[PDB]
Amino acid sequence: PQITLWKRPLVTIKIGGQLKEALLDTGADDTVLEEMNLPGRWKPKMIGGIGGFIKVRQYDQILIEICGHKAIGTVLVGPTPVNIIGRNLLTQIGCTLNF
Amino acid sequence: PQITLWKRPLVTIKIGGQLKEALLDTGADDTVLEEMNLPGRWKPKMIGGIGGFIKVRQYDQILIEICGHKAIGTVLVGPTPVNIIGRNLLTQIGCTLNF
Numbered sequence: 001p002q003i004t005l006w007k008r009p010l011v012t013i014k015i016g017g018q019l020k021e022a023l024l025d026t027g028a029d030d031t032v033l034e035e036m037n038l039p040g041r042w043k044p045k046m047i048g049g050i051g052g053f054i055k056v057r058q059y060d061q062i063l064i065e066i067c068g069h070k071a072i073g074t075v076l077v078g079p080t081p082v083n084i085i086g087r088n089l090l091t092q093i094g095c096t097l098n099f
Numbered sequence: 100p101q102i103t104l105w106k107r108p109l110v111t112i113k114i115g116g117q118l119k120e121a122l123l124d125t126g127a128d129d130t131v132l133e134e135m136n137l138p139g140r141w142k143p144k145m146i147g148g149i150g151g152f153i154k155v156r157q158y159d160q161i162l163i164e165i166c167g168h169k170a171i172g173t174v175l176v177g178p179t180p181v182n183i184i185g186r187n188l189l190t191q192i193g194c195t196l197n198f
């Protein structure tokens with residue numbers, strides 16, 4: 001679809017069998033989701049933005065469906081204020097910025 | 100144009116007559132630039148991000164050109180790690196997400 005930017009570009013995603021709302025974020029290298037207990041091994045990671053760094057759990061080869069488009073990649077889990085879909089997954093659904 | 104997300108969507112902007120590189124960021128409500136000397140009056144403000152809050156200088160009704168597209172709106176100046184063009188200006192240049 002086409003998503004305008006008058007409001008936060010929030011969409012429904014499916015991950016680990018759950019539905020969630022997430023921000024499509026071209027300014028994020030990586031995908032970061034609110035605390036959830038996902039099965040599997042994980043690696044510790046630090047990610048930063050405005051204001052500093054937070055500690056997260058890195059899960060690899062996680063499937064996520066974003067408005068019916070499927071993507072598979074690394075998903076980070078930690079105390080973020082909002083679920084963020086980053087470029088590592090946006091590229092897989094064919095997402096572009098246009099103006 | 101149409102911009103893919105395999106790399107960071109960095110573009111050249113012109114503000115206060117100076118050229119800079121900035122990230123087109125659908126995940127930012129507001130535009131935030133690294134320290135610069137901008138003409139005009141300003142008011143202190145705080146904005147938050149993934150790591151917490153930073154102190155910024157809010158400049159209103161600033162002219163900025165983003166790959167030749169003109170916008171006039173609020174620009175925050177402060178210790179951000181990267182120059183970010185947020186939705187308040189992306190909307191003025193007609194930017195949408197498409198997939």
Ligand SMILES: CC[C@H](C)[C@H](NC(=O)OC)C(=O)N[C@@H](Cc1ccccc1)[C@@H](O)C[C@H](Cc1ccccc1)NC(=O)O[C@H]1CO[C@H]2OCC[C@H]21
Pocket residue numbers: 025026027028029030031032047048049050081082084086124125126127128129130131146147148149179180181183185
């Ligand atoms: C991938 C890890 C991080 C998510 C990612 N870092 C990364 O990719 O570094 C490599 C990252 O922080 N990206 C941000 C831009 C950015 C800043 C610093 C360095 C690199 C890129 C932005 O795209 C997402 C962020 C999401 C958000 C967080 C908290 C509350 C609401 C929304 N928005 C945001 O901070 O916005 C500010 C500015 O406007 C205001 O509205 C929203 C809050 C205010």
